[PDB]
Amino acid sequence: AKTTPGGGAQASQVAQQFHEGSSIYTNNPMDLRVSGTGFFAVAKERLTP
């Protein structure tokens, strides 16, 4: 138990840190941003959402 050293390092997880990013301004009404928590929903095909 005490005479055996460690077996190295194993990768645990690559996280996906979700802190809010900055904003740029295009003055274009079709450019939208979620200020705070939320995601847009986008459908590959028009019929099936």
Next chain:
Amino acid sequence: AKTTPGGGAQASQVAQQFHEGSSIYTNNPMDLRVSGTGFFAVAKERLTP
């Protein structure tokens, strides 16, 4: 909450300040001015008002 600084300045609105402007004098009866509150109404086509 407290370790994060601000994100800059965002344009709020360009207002349209409506305080009365000064008047010039032409001594011509066809030149009109609205002293106080109100607008003239002008129509592009004579038939449609």
